[PDB]
Design an enzyme around this catalytic site. Structure first.
Site, short mmCIF file in Angstrom:
data_model
loop_
_atom_site.label_atom_id
_atom_site.label_comp_id
_atom_site.label_asym_id
_atom_site.label_seq_id
_atom_site.Cartn_x
_atom_site.Cartn_y
_atom_site.Cartn_z
N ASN B 190 -57.09 4.56 8.02
CA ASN B 190 -55.63 4.43 8.11
C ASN B 190 -55.02 5.15 9.33
O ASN B 190 -53.79 5.32 9.40
CB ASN B 190 -54.95 4.95 6.85
CG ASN B 190 -55.45 4.32 5.59
OD1 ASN B 190 -55.79 5.00 4.62
ND2 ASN B 190 -55.53 2.99 5.58
N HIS B 192 -55.28 8.29 10.23
CA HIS B 192 -54.88 9.66 9.92
C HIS B 192 -56.08 10.57 10.17
O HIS B 192 -57.22 10.16 9.90
CB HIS B 192 -54.40 9.79 8.47
CG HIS B 192 -53.03 9.22 8.25
ND1 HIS B 192 -51.91 10.02 8.26
CD2 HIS B 192 -52.65 7.92 8.12
CE1 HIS B 192 -50.87 9.20 8.11
NE2 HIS B 192 -51.27 7.93 8.01
N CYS B 227 -51.99 17.00 11.24
CA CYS B 227 -52.00 16.99 12.71
C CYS B 227 -51.88 15.49 13.03
O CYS B 227 -52.69 14.69 12.53
CB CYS B 227 -53.29 17.60 13.28
SG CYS B 227 -53.61 17.21 15.03
#
Ligand SMILES: Nc1nc2ccccc2s1
Ligand SMILES: Nc1nc2ccccc2s1
Ligand SMILES: Nc1nc2ccccc2s1
Ligand SMILES: Nc1nc2ccccc2s1
Lengths: 268, 269
Positions: B190, B192, B227
């Site tokens: 995804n 991330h 982050c």
């Protein structure tokens, strides 16, 4: 995994893991490269080589000699999906005194269709001086018994993509990713940057728009010098065209070349 | 891998790979964390959850809700060697409305001895707003049938390490690794940053002399903020202690916003 009946090649099956896939839920090219390395290591183990180094005979170990990759070339037709089983067959073949080639064939385990292929060139280097020194025929005799004698090529064609000369990218590059540094996960058991890390660094300067609309078909990478655990790398890319790119990795400071390569991408 | 007889836990065996080991030819703690994630994902798949997100029911997917890790705690007694087979058992348990816990037990496949254990706390968050918003009891009802009802803890001890509060490291840090950035391999499906990357970033500021003479026994990591793929991180460590203990802090270079805090415990080799 297991050696084949004739003992001259090795096969292993891998179930693609959840963290090994990209946005398309299929294995990344770095996951593929890591599996090629793993099947190569298991092949070396199966034929008696020790866990000390990688595929070093006792004679090479006595002389402080190791195998080092000079080039990696990977062609993928279909990346395996998360949970799919991919079967990989690998073998080596001497190319005279120059060095040794390791080839791989990737297949869909259900259909038996070839989904990818790869080839690599390896040279003998003294681990301490980094020189490609004079070695003598008694070292090669030790390896010949583990390799097929008739030519067996994953890329058999004369003058194919895997053997093409790669030019040096000239500044200004079209795209760049600066200040790339390895972390502890990028190191191997001997505290050297793993070869797959350089593939990741090359691909860092490909624009997001390309990654989002294309699939990587071919990557050819030359290895000239290692990135030490304290070096910093710049990744440069220029379009040369399907979309084709020329790549250069160099140390952030003085611009010393560590790798050069090319990639070919096809629209999704 | 397979669900156990009672269908309330899942087990899987992994052969440790050549690139998965460190200098001692045994699995790194990041390889262990990646295997914990993999067995967790295979457990979710085995009980009917779709490949869409991670352990999301149709009701959660309709409401745009996801599970997010708030804490990871791993204790390793022996790291498996290259070529060894490690068996991992995992299960989940509700902890009321607050969230859910996923636990793991690692064993040597040959001897059957427990070589490690882990626990994690997860919360429901709206994927779009990042809020831990109000969710009805009908969502939890959907998960209860896949969890044991009697308490089953990987960490049963009274004031056990897995639940201890972690303080905030104060400047100046004793050690630091500055300017850490994720690359494409650090991202999940995804886009991330993978939770294991933060473990690697925490460990970047441990001195080389410690890594060379000690083995990591315990790591506890809180996750406060993500982050983003374009953020830059600083990793800070201070000794707090035969055993060596450290306090850790990960924060964005952009202004010093905290993304993680943790502690590690190391024993002399
Ligand atoms: N199949 C692909 N694997 C990767 C890995 C890194 C960056 C881009 C790509 S496209
Ligand atoms: N250089 C070579 N290393 C190996 C490892 C396994 C099988 C054949 C060969 S030839
Ligand atoms: N077992 C260990 N795994 C790691 C991973 C990264 C840095 C240090 C250590 S010690
Ligand atoms: N939150 C929860 N997700 C899962 C996934 C698999 C089994 C049990 C549970 S409870």
């Amino acid at each position: 995994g297991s050696l084949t009946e004739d003992g001259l090649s090795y096969k292993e099956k891998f179930v693609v893991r959840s963290y090994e896939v990209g946005s398309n839920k299929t294995a990344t090219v770095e996951t593929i490269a890591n599996l090629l390395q793993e099947v190569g290591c298991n092949h070396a183990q199966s034929v008696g080589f020790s866990t000390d180094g990688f595929a070093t005979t006792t004679t090479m170990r006595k002389l402080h000699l190791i195998w080092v990759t000079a080039r990696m070339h990977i062609e993928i037709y279909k990346y395996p999906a998360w949970g799919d089983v991919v079967e990989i067959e690998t073998w080596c073949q001497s190319e005279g005194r120059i060095g040794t080639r390791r080839d791989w064939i990737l297949k869909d385990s259900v259909t038996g269709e070839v989904t990818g292929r790869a080839t690599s060139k390896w040279v003998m280097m003294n681990q301490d001086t980094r020189r490609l020194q004079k070695v003598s025929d008694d070292v090669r005799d030790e390896y010949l018994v583990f390799c097929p004698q008739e030519p067996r090529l994953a890329f058999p064609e004369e003058n194919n993509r895997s053997l093409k000369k790669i030019p040096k990218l000239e500044d200004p590059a079209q795209y760049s990713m600066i200040g790339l540094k390895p972390r502890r996960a990028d190191l191997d058991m001997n505290q050297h940057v793993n070869n797959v890390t350089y593939i990741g660094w090359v691909l860092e300067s490909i624009p997001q728009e390309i990654v989002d609309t294309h699939e990587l078909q071919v990557i050819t990478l030359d290895y000239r010098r290692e990135c030490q655990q304290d070096d910093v790398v710049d990744s440069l890319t220029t379009t040369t065209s399907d979309s084709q790119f020329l790549h250069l990795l160099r140390l952030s400071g003085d611009g010393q070349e560590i790798n050069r390569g090319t990639t070919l991408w096809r629209k999704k």
